[PDB]
Amino acid sequence: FNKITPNLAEFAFSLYRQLAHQSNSTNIFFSPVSIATAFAMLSLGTKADTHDEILEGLNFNLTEIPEAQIHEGFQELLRTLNQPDSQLQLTTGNGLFLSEGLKLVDKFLEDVKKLYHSEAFTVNFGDTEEAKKQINDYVEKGTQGKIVDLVKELDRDTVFALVNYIFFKGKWERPFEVKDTEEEDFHVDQVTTVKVPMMKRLGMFNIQHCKKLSSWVLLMKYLGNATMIFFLPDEGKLQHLENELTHDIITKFLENEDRRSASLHLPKLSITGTYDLKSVLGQLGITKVFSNGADLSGVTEEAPLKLSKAVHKAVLTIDEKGTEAAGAMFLEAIPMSIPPEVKFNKPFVFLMIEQNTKSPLFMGKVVNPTQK
C-alpha cells in the first residue's frame, strides 16, 4: 500500500531544498502532491526521453518502479482528496490550455479527464491578452475568487500552458480559542522582532523535542484526513533541520501515540506561494518538455508542440477553529506539572500529510508570518 509515497516525499524535499537555496530570506510554500500529479498526468502525453525526464524529476526510478504503479498511486491519492464527505476543505485543480488549431489525440484528453479528473481547454493563442484572461478567469472561478490574475505574461509563441492551483482552509480537531489570540513578538532574526497575531492554548499534544533534528516537532490533526507537522529548530539550527529531514524520520513521528502537556503559541497565518515550474522543475532535470525538442506526440501527432508556460500557486490559512459551528467538544486532561512553553515565534518549517496515503500535501517555511 502507498507505493509512491516515498517518491513524493523525496520530491517534496528535493523541491524544498532547491527553493531554500535560491532564496534564504523569504517564505516558501508549495504542494508536492499537486505539482507531481500535474506532471505525472502530463507525462501520459509524452514519450521517450521527454517522458522519462518528467518521471525521474518527480523522483521515480524507472528501472525499479513500473509505470502502471506510478499512475495507480496517483489515482488512488486523487480518490482520497476529491471525495464527497471530506471535512478537509482542500480544492486543487489543473488546467491545460492548448491552441485551438491543434489536432488533439482523443486518448490523451480521455486520460486527463477520466484518470486524473482534470480539465483541458482549447484557446486562441493568437490573442495573447485574451488567452491569459481566459486562463486567469478559469483559476479565479475554480477558487471562488481566491486566486486572481495568476498568469501575468504569455510569450507570443505560446501554444500550450499549464496552471496548477491548490487552496486549503483547515479546521483543527483540537482548536484554539479566538479569545486567546494576542499580538506577540516573532523573532525574524536573533536581534529583531516584529509583532504578529499569535494563537495559544494549553493542551495535550503530539509533541517532542527531537535530538536528530535539533528541533521541537509538533503534530496537529485536522478535521478530515490530514495532519500538519511543525518543526521548530533550536537556536541556529534551521539549516541543520532542513538538511536532516528524511521520509523515515517523518514516518516515525506519525506513528507516535504519546501525548504530553504544552503551552503552545502558534501564529495565525495567511500564506501563498507562486512558482514558475519551467524554471523550478528545470533545475530538477525536467527540461525537454519545455523545449522545442519536446516529444508530446501523445497530445498531438502531426504538429510540433512544447509546454511554454507552467505555473503553480498554493494558498493556505492557519487560524483558531475554522468554523462557527461547535464540533465534538474534546476535553483533554492536563496534569499538575509545569508544561513546556513551545513558541513558534521564529522561523520554522512545516509539512502537511494526508492521513490515508501519508503523502505530502504541502511543505513550507515561515521566515516572517506577515511577509505578505
XYZ file of N, CA and C in Angstrom, residues 213-334:
366
model
N 16.982 16.137 14.804
C 16.666 17.335 14.040
C 16.991 18.614 14.794
N 17.425 18.509 16.048
C 17.645 19.676 16.899
C 16.431 20.601 16.865
N 15.241 20.007 16.953
C 14.012 20.762 16.773
C 12.905 20.202 17.651
N 11.997 21.081 18.055
C 10.693 20.631 18.512
C 9.883 20.186 17.299
N 9.125 19.103 17.468
C 8.314 18.509 16.409
C 6.896 18.352 16.939
N 5.964 19.086 16.344
C 4.564 19.126 16.737
C 3.694 18.556 15.627
N 2.785 17.649 15.972
C 1.814 17.112 15.022
C 0.416 17.493 15.485
N -0.342 18.154 14.613
C -1.703 18.555 14.930
C -2.643 18.079 13.841
N -3.692 17.373 14.246
C -4.617 16.785 13.300
C -5.688 17.784 12.894
N -6.061 17.739 11.622
C -7.220 18.461 11.137
C -8.460 17.585 11.239
N -9.621 18.232 11.207
C -10.854 17.532 10.877
C -10.780 17.108 9.416
N -11.067 15.845 9.150
C -10.824 15.310 7.830
C -9.602 14.420 7.847
N -8.918 14.308 6.715
C -7.877 13.302 6.587
C -6.504 13.932 6.424
N -6.038 14.684 7.417
C -4.695 15.229 7.288
C -4.179 15.694 8.641
N -2.846 15.757 8.731
C -2.105 16.224 9.900
C -1.054 17.227 9.459
N -0.926 18.330 10.193
C 0.167 19.269 9.974
C 1.304 18.968 10.939
N 2.505 18.826 10.401
C 3.713 18.691 11.193
C 4.443 20.024 11.173
N 4.769 20.528 12.351
C 5.509 21.769 12.517
C 6.869 21.464 13.138
N 7.931 22.029 12.571
C 9.292 21.821 13.054
C 9.870 23.157 13.513
N 10.245 23.241 14.793
C 10.816 24.460 15.372
C 12.289 24.224 15.684
N 13.219 24.728 14.872
C 14.642 24.449 15.122
C 15.177 25.148 16.365
N 16.084 24.464 17.060
C 16.819 25.106 18.140
C 17.612 26.293 17.586
N 18.115 27.126 18.494
C 18.874 28.305 18.094
C 19.968 27.930 17.100
N 19.978 28.621 15.962
C 20.995 28.417 14.949
C 20.980 27.063 14.284
N 19.837 26.378 14.278
C 19.752 25.018 13.763
C 18.785 24.884 12.595
N 18.296 25.993 12.037
C 17.352 25.883 10.927
C 17.955 25.100 9.766
N 19.182 25.444 9.362
C 19.804 24.747 8.241
C 20.020 23.274 8.563
N 20.373 22.963 9.812
C 20.557 21.569 10.197
C 19.249 20.791 10.082
N 18.143 21.386 10.531
C 16.838 20.745 10.392
C 16.521 20.463 8.928
N 16.697 21.462 8.064
C 16.384 21.276 6.652
C 17.217 20.152 6.046
N 18.481 20.036 6.459
C 19.361 19.021 5.892
C 19.001 17.617 6.362
N 18.527 17.472 7.598
C 18.370 16.152 8.197
C 17.000 15.527 7.960
N 16.029 16.279 7.449
C 14.714 15.714 7.175
C 14.810 14.532 6.215
N 14.087 13.464 6.544
C 14.007 12.276 5.709
C 12.622 11.669 5.878
N 12.236 10.832 4.917
C 10.897 10.258 4.949
C 10.716 9.327 6.144
N 11.747 8.556 6.489
C 11.617 7.607 7.591
C 11.521 8.312 8.939
N 12.193 9.452 9.097
C 12.020 10.255 10.304
C 10.570 10.714 10.431
N 9.978 11.159 9.322
C 8.586 11.605 9.333
C 7.656 10.452 9.685
N 7.913 9.269 9.121
C 7.062 8.120 9.411
C 7.070 7.798 10.901
N 8.251 7.804 11.526
C 8.327 7.578 12.967
C 7.449 8.563 13.735
N 7.487 9.848 13.362
C 6.673 10.843 14.055
C 5.184 10.530 13.928
N 4.736 10.135 12.730
C 3.319 9.869 12.518
C 2.835 8.664 13.310
N 3.738 7.776 13.708
C 3.367 6.607 14.492
C 3.365 6.861 15.997
N 3.748 8.055 16.447
C 3.820 8.333 17.879
C 2.423 8.497 18.472
N 2.138 7.753 19.543
C 0.858 7.845 20.235
C 0.967 8.532 21.589
N 2.175 8.879 22.018
C 2.361 9.560 23.290
C 1.940 11.021 23.187
N 1.319 11.518 24.252
C 0.857 12.894 24.327
C 1.373 13.493 25.622
N 1.770 14.762 25.568
C 2.269 15.462 26.742
C 1.705 16.875 26.742
N 1.693 17.482 27.916
C 1.174 18.831 28.025
C 2.183 19.838 27.491
N 1.652 20.909 26.919
C 2.479 22.016 26.473
C 1.617 23.256 26.368
N 2.257 24.407 26.577
C 1.652 25.714 26.342
C 2.124 26.161 24.963
N 1.272 25.974 23.971
C 1.636 26.171 22.573
C 1.278 27.577 22.124
N 2.237 28.260 21.499
C 1.999 29.533 20.828
C 2.298 29.330 19.348
N 1.301 29.588 18.504
C 1.371 29.327 17.068
C 0.782 30.506 16.297
N 1.496 31.069 15.328
C 0.958 32.251 14.645
C -0.243 31.919 13.782
N -1.208 32.838 13.764
C -2.154 32.862 12.669
C -1.370 33.058 11.383
N -1.942 32.631 10.271
C -1.148 32.760 9.065
C -2.018 32.741 7.829
N -1.678 33.633 6.898
C -2.185 33.628 5.537
C -0.952 33.579 4.650
N -0.735 32.454 3.976
C 0.481 32.257 3.201
C 0.109 31.810 1.799
N 0.857 32.311 0.825
C 0.753 31.859 -0.551
C 2.154 31.647 -1.098
N 2.233 30.800 -2.114
C 3.457 30.599 -2.859
C 3.123 30.479 -4.329
N 3.876 31.184 -5.176
C 3.698 31.158 -6.625
C 5.039 30.860 -7.276
N 5.058 29.879 -8.184
C 6.299 29.397 -8.769
C 6.136 29.140 -10.262
N 7.147 29.578 -11.018
C 7.333 29.229 -12.424
C 7.910 27.823 -12.479
N 7.078 26.853 -12.861
C 7.507 25.463 -12.849
C 8.503 25.151 -13.959
N 8.511 25.912 -15.054
C 9.560 25.705 -16.052
C 10.929 25.931 -15.424
N 11.075 27.035 -14.695
C 12.346 27.353 -14.057
C 12.662 26.363 -12.946
N 11.704 26.128 -12.053
C 11.980 25.334 -10.865
C 12.195 23.871 -11.228
N 11.308 23.313 -12.055
C 11.440 21.905 -12.407
C 12.599 21.689 -13.369
N 12.958 22.715 -14.145
C 14.154 22.623 -14.967
C 15.393 22.324 -14.145
N 15.495 22.927 -12.954
C 16.621 22.667 -12.067
C 16.618 21.246 -11.520
N 15.457 20.595 -11.469
C 15.351 19.207 -11.047
C 15.496 18.228 -12.203
N 15.767 18.715 -13.413
C 16.040 17.857 -14.546
C 14.920 17.728 -15.556
N 13.806 18.427 -15.363
C 12.682 18.373 -16.292
C 12.851 19.540 -17.261
N 13.393 19.254 -18.454
C 13.717 20.331 -19.387
C 13.158 20.115 -20.786
N 13.148 18.874 -21.284
C 12.811 18.645 -22.686
C 11.371 19.042 -22.987
N 10.440 18.745 -22.075
C 9.033 19.032 -22.341
C 8.788 20.528 -22.510
N 9.678 21.367 -21.988
C 9.599 22.814 -22.129
C 10.379 23.336 -23.332
N 10.957 22.451 -24.141
C 11.871 22.835 -25.207
C 11.286 22.468 -26.562
N 11.838 23.089 -27.602
C 11.369 22.816 -28.954
C 11.485 21.339 -29.308
N 12.423 20.626 -28.699
C 12.554 19.216 -28.997
C 11.575 18.303 -28.300
N 10.565 18.851 -27.627
C 9.714 18.037 -26.773
C 8.955 16.978 -27.558
N 8.926 15.759 -27.023
C 8.128 14.689 -27.615
C 6.791 14.655 -26.882
N 5.850 15.450 -27.388
C 4.473 15.492 -26.918
C 3.534 14.861 -27.943
N 4.001 13.802 -28.611
C 3.208 13.162 -29.653
C 1.991 12.410 -29.125
N 1.893 12.165 -27.812
C 0.653 11.655 -27.260
C -0.429 12.702 -27.105
N -0.068 13.977 -27.231
C -1.032 15.077 -27.187
C -1.481 15.464 -28.586
N -0.526 15.606 -29.501
C -0.826 15.914 -30.895
C 0.207 15.211 -31.765
N -0.266 14.506 -32.799
C 0.614 13.653 -33.597
C 1.340 14.427 -34.692
N 0.632 15.303 -35.403
C 1.193 15.897 -36.611
C 2.124 17.062 -36.294
N 1.689 17.980 -35.431
C 2.403 19.238 -35.313
C 3.373 19.226 -34.135
N 4.453 20.003 -34.220
C 5.337 20.156 -33.059
C 4.598 20.821 -31.910
N 5.034 20.513 -30.691
C 4.404 21.076 -29.504
C 5.424 21.109 -28.379
N 5.368 22.164 -27.571
C 6.117 22.222 -26.322
C 5.256 22.915 -25.280
N 5.570 22.670 -24.011
C 4.898 23.367 -22.915
C 5.589 24.707 -22.686
N 4.906 25.810 -23.020
C 5.527 27.125 -22.937
C 5.369 27.800 -21.587
N 4.372 27.407 -20.802
C 4.067 28.091 -19.553
C 3.562 27.050 -18.571
N 4.088 27.085 -17.347
C 3.626 26.190 -16.291
C 3.755 26.918 -14.961
N 2.622 27.148 -14.295
C 2.574 27.944 -13.073
C 1.895 27.153 -11.961
N 2.456 27.256 -10.757
C 1.866 26.691 -9.547
C 1.575 27.820 -8.569
N 0.369 27.840 -8.023
C 0.095 28.685 -6.864
C -0.604 27.876 -5.783
N -0.115 28.035 -4.558
C -0.668 27.383 -3.378
C -1.042 28.445 -2.349
N -2.200 28.268 -1.716
C -2.745 29.221 -0.747
C -3.190 28.456 0.493
N -2.823 28.953 1.672
C -3.224 28.277 2.897
C -3.462 29.285 4.010
N -4.432 28.970 4.859
C -4.711 29.741 6.061
C -4.504 28.847 7.270
N -3.961 29.436 8.334
C -3.888 28.817 9.654
C -4.642 29.747 10.589
N -5.687 29.230 11.236
C -6.442 30.017 12.203
C -6.892 29.098 13.337
N -7.737 29.642 14.220
C -8.001 29.020 15.518
C -8.894 27.796 15.398
N -9.938 27.881 14.580
C -11.029 26.916 14.652
C -11.525 26.576 13.256
N -11.737 27.598 12.429
C -12.174 27.389 11.065
C -13.664 27.219 10.877
N -14.471 27.507 11.893
C -15.911 27.321 11.786
C -16.582 27.938 13.002
N -17.773 28.495 12.783
C -18.600 28.978 13.880
C -19.421 27.867 14.521
N -19.424 26.674 13.931
C -20.162 25.549 14.481
C -19.355 24.870 15.578
N -20.051 24.423 16.618
C -19.423 23.641 17.674
C -19.295 22.196 17.212
N -18.079 21.670 17.243
C -17.835 20.276 16.946
C -17.903 19.436 18.202
N -17.331 18.239 18.114
C -17.164 17.415 19.302
C -16.251 18.139 20.280
N -16.734 18.345 21.500
C -16.006 19.138 22.487
C -14.991 18.225 23.174
N -13.867 18.007 22.487
C -12.791 17.196 23.042
C -12.238 17.849 24.303
N -12.282 17.116 25.415
C -11.763 17.560 26.704
C -10.457 16.830 26.992
N -9.362 17.578 27.147
C -8.045 16.998 27.381
C -7.667 17.137 28.850
N -7.162 16.051 29.440
C -6.783 16.031 30.851
C -5.344 16.514 31.013
N -5.167 17.615 31.729
C -3.882 18.307 31.821
C -3.277 18.033 33.194
